[PDB]
Paper text:
CLC-2 is a voltage-gated chloride channel that contributes to electrical excitability and ion homeostasis in many different tissues. Among the nine mammalian CLC homologs, CLC-2 is uniquely activated by hyperpolarization, rather than depolarization, of the plasma membrane. The TM region of CLC-2 displays a typical CLC family symmetric homodimeric structure, with each subunit containing an independent Cl− pathway. All eukaryotic CLCs contain a pair of ‘cystathionine β-synthase’ (CBS) domains in their intracellular C-terminal domain (CTD).
During the 3D classification data processing with a C1 reconstruction (no symmetry imposed), two distinct conformations were separated from the same CLC-2 dataset. The main structural differences occur at the intracellular domain, with one class exhibiting a symmetric arrangement and the other, asymmetric. These two conformations are named as CLC2-CTDsym and CLC2-CTDasym, respectively. In the asymmetric arrangement (CLC2-CTDasym), one of the CTDs rotates toward the TM region approximately 35° relative to the conformation in the symmetric structure. Structural comparison focused on individual CTDs within the two classes reveals low RMSD values (~1 Å), which indicates that the CTD undergoes a rigid body movement to accomplish the conformational change. In CLC2-CTDasym, only the subunit whose CTD adopts the ‘symmetric’ orientation (seen in CLC2-CTDsym) contains the hairpin density; in the subunit with the rotated CTD, no hairpin density is observed. Along with the absence of hairpin density, the subunit with the rotated CTD exhibits a difference in the linker connecting TM helices J and K, which is poorly resolved and insufficient for model building. A key aspect of our revised framework is that ball-and-chain gating is coupled to CTD conformational change: close examination of the state with the CTD rotated reveals that the hairpin cannot access its pore-blocking site in this state. Thus, CTD rotation facilitates hairpin release and channel opening. In contrast to CLC-0, where movements in the CTD have been linked to the highly cooperative conformational change involved in common gating, our structures illustrate that in CLC-2 the CTDs can move independently of one another.
Author numbering:
A (entry chain A): 14 to 28, 88 to 225, 231 to 297, 301 to 408, 419 to 644, 774 to 841
B (entry chain B): 88 to 225, 231 to 297, 301 to 352, 362 to 408, 419 to 568, 577 to 644, 774 to 839
The structure:
């Protein structure tokens, strides 16, 4: 059991019925998502009304423009800190750790639910570049846990499956994409998923989508969030494929750079102890300063006109996916009177990159999927506009028909950058669900594959990076194509010094052994000379043996050093063990599936070594 | 960079093979129509050609498959699912099997019989991967299984021209775990195959989607039309369960009751009923499978060209659709059991499309001016109903939910996603409640090893025979040990008294050295009988074992993960038992 400790940016962790349950989970998640969306829309509408009311002087417009988001972010951070400090940030890495066996202290309580809901609503009510997929996963998991609490009024296996279904429900409700949501949730929270549990997520997401449609028709887009209208007859040509490949490669490099920049930002001010202490005594100055800095640069009368600061995230995504060519309201916002579309796109890309990283490193419930999606869409739109300008009449034409469509480039770029950042290939399906069309399928697959290859060659995923930052249990993923590990054996990476005890030992031996292990379990051995393994023992239990046979109720303590009879103790008969010539592939696979953190190496029945997650991490990294 | 090169070469080879096979099938189908229509004006000659062409093709396919490689008969998905679980089939991935499968599939699909390609394509892709792996060596067991899984994904994708849907379908029918890296490798190889197919479709010339639809993008369906899309799913689930039951019952009956007569009789019976000017006008027998699927997916309303085959002068669309559904159902159920390389995905797809079209036309006739009246500009689109029904029936038969993605890549549109998902979920629920999957039924028919599904520990289910050899054993015990047992591999122990496990030795190696030592040398065969020298063998030093007190659930989970079929039970380093899928006799 791990407990949250508060830090500046992220924190640290220190030491029959199925159908009804799925239907109820889907309905609850749909209702909660609808309520949150309504609240966020109301907040944005209030911001627009207040901004339109005060059109007198630039000073007052600036004051309102920088006062609304700062107040919203400060209130969100304060409310989250008062109720549940552990509800800060994305919830995908924490649930990935939970699904592997580890237990977090109070991660699935009602207070955390209230804090997460209110904080996400308040933080997303401002205009900061933040997402909601991780918070949605966490909220869905808490909803499933509370439903299990209610419906109760073997067990361990059931809970994990329900949480796995809840993650898919959360992703699907976040993107309004059942299939894409389930496939994305499978890739980011597990490595070996049972085929039997494949239908549960699809069923729950389908029920959620049906409830969404019913609510949409009872409340008055309906089909797709960001519906696009592209021609079905030759949307692209053959010679445009190199452009899509270039987009994919650049997106992979950019995703690696984004993950590296986020990690570097987090690390830098974990140093600088004086600034860190001064901010830790404030607890509300850092988010306020970040919000004030970001909002100032997006002021439309000032610097915000050169990066489309007047547009919101939904409006920014809608204009990039349109079926018009800007080069030859989308063009009005993306073509300021003093510049062209290219300069605006470049400035938008750079500023949004660094601002999105910095904003995702602040203490509020937030995600990082939509910002990178928008950045990738902008980069793809830039590439498409360049191609359209270079070929005004087409790339293969007789009567100048079938011109270049720059919106497919934006779709391809968004999917490629999202996949590169998250190390997933389901962003293709996600973007097909989001846009409502499947015409630009092959370029999307090509770009996603290339971006994933480059990103996995360069840097780890964002969620794995956050896991490393928070010091949670971390099993690095084996190289997809970077290297080979079919020749490395367990005899090399193991540690040849094993904390162990003997069957015929004395209490002095236990006293000497206990302090130097620094581990959870002790290995029972027949005899020191034979070194034959018989089982595993608990460190607390062998402490209790000394505490029980060496006690006031009987100095005398130094008189009693007889050999310890292990009959009273309880021994694990079959701990997890391996053999001498086991390959790294099998060890990694069993560690990944069983969710274990410790294995014994055995040679002809004798104890020769031990393997831990740390040794595996060094073996993979080196 | 061996992985990327292997995947690229696999994709290229599979794309080329699929293109060649499609060209051959199209040539055969055109040659049928040429002789059918060009030079015949009499009823008797037309009938004679109509029956004699498919009969000759099917008889040649069956004879060629039997003579060359009998293992090429049937689908390839159940056998590859068995192979990926650690079982070994005798000669399932050789060159003769490849040639027999290719020629038999080309000849069988050249006729007008209702057969598919997904299983044969999976088998051919796996064979291509095995041959490529053999050629590239100019041998880790763990590396080969991953490549076979990638080959299955490539085969499905090339069959349906649906890369993502093909990968998802292949993972769901030939595996028990969703491995993410397998998904990534299949994605990569299917993307390369799709690129090659796109290049070929431009160099030669149904580009993009195979059965592209042109439904309107603004309000294709209403909320009140959803109950129909659920009725379709429930009916499709029931129909899929009935289809699996009927196929199994057809297979069983022939067992209770000269090998070139049954396929010929089946072909002559089926082709007689589909003869157009006789009974073929009442079930649209003049259309091929591609044209049958094309007309059922159009954006026109019949009840308000090539779609006039469903409206004969002496009948209407409803009667023709019902007759087509019934006759094609029983004909496909019968025809999928003849000794030729064949699949069953497409006939089920067409039957589901016909049922969906029937339901959609009924709804369109019920609401001539559109649902919710008001004389609105949005009316019923019966093509989407056909898509929904086809996807639902295919998913119900195959116990899969990736048929939705498959149909989305097939039609080129994703406008009907919610009804398709609802129908697929309902059909899967009903079918899984009623009957097992078609591939599982075939596995149980062929009596292949399989793992069931999931107090008791590995000490109880184990068997203590465990054929083995000792390090100090002579050639007399090696002959004695080999004769009694029949297993693929043998265990190596230190001594009969010690019984300390040292690894495992293959059956091929021991019989080779026994023959080599007792080979003619410079009576003397029995004279030497010296203790064997194991220093020149191929000893596996790390077989995967199980501790004595391991639980059944832990044993079950490791067996599914590792793709193995037998484990060694060990006490303190001593061999005490073996577990070779004895969970089938204990987890049932």
């Amino acid at each position: 059991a791990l407990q949250y400790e508060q830090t500046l940016m992220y924190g640290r962790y220190t030491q029959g019925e199925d159908w009804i349950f799925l239907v109820l989970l889907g309905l609850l998640m749909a209702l909660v998502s609808w309520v949150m969306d309504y609240a966020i829309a109301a907040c944005l509408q209030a911001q627009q009304w207040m901004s339109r009311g005060l059109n007198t002087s630039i000073l007052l417009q600036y004051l309102a423009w920088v006062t609304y988001p700062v107040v919203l972010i400060t209130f969100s951070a304060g409310f989250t800190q008062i109720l549940a400090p552990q509800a800060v940030g994305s919830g995908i890495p924490e649930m990935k750790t939970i699904l592997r066996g580890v237990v977090l202290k109070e991660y699935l309580t009602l207070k955390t639910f209230i804090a997460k809901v209110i904080g996400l609503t308040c933080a997303l009510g401002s205009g900061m570049p933040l997402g909601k997929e991780g918070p949605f996963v966490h909220i869905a998991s808490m909803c499933a846990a509370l439903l299990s609490k209610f419906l109760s009024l073997e067990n361990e296996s059931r809970n994990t499956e329900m949480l796995a279904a809840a993650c898919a429900v959360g992703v699907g409700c976040c993107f309004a994409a059942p299939i894409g949501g389930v496939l994305f949730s499978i890739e980011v929270t597990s490595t070996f998923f049972a085929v039997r549990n494949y239908w549960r997520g699809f069923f729950a997401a389908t029920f959620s989508a049906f409830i969404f449609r019913v609510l949409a028709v009872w409340n008055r887009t309906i089909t797709a969030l960001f519906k696009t209208r592209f021609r079905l007859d030759f949307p692209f040509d053959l010679q445009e494929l190199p452009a899509f490949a270039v987009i994919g490669i650049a997106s992979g490099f950019g995703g690696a750079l984004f993950v590296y920049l986020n990690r570097k930002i987090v690390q830098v001010m974990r140093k600088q102890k004086t600034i860190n202490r001064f901010l830790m005594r404030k607890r509300l100055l850092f988010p306020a300063l970040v919000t004030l800095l970001i909002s100032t640069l997006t002021f439309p009368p000032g610097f915000g006109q050169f990066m489309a600061g007047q547009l919101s995230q939904k409006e920014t995504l809608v204009t990039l996916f349109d079926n018009r060519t800007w080069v030859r309201s989308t063009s009005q916002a993306w073509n300021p009177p003093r510049a062209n579309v290219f300069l605006t796109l470049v400035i938008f890309i750079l500023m949004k990159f660094w601002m999105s990283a910095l904003a995702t490193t602040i203490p509020v419930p937030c995600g990082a999927f939509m910002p990178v999606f928008v950045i990738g869409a902008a980069f793809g739109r830039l590439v498409g506009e360049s191609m359209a300008a270079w070929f005004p009449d087409g790339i293969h034409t007789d009567s100048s028909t079938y011109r270049i469509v720059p919106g497919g480039y934006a779709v391809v770029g968004a999917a490629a950058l999202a996949g590169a950042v998250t190390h997933t290939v389901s962003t293709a399906v996600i973007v097909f669900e989001l846009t409502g069309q499947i015409a630009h399928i092959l370029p999307v697959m090509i770009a996603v594959i290339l971006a994933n290859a480059v990103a996995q060659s360069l840097q780890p995923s964002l969620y794995d990076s956050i896991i490393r930052i928070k010091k949670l249990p971390y099993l690095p993923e084996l190289g997809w194509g970077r290297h080979q590990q079919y020749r490395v054996r367990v005899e090399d990476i193991m540690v040849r010094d094993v904390p162990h005890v003997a069957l015929s030992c004395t209490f002095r031996d236990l006293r000497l052994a206990l302090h130097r292990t620094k581990g959870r379990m002790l290995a029972l051995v027949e005899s020191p000379e034979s070194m034959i393994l018989l089982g595993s023992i608990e460190r607390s239990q062998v402490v209790a043996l000394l505490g029980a046979q060496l006690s006031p109720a009987r100095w005398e303590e130094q008189q009693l050093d007889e050999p310890v009879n292990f009959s009273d103790c309880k021994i694990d008969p079959a701990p997890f063990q391996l053999v001498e010539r086991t390959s790294l592939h099998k060890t990694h696979t069993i560690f990944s599936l069983l969710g274990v953190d410790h294995a014994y190496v055995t040679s002809i029945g004798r104890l020769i070594g031990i393997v831990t997650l740390k040794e595996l991490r060094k073996a993979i990294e080196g």
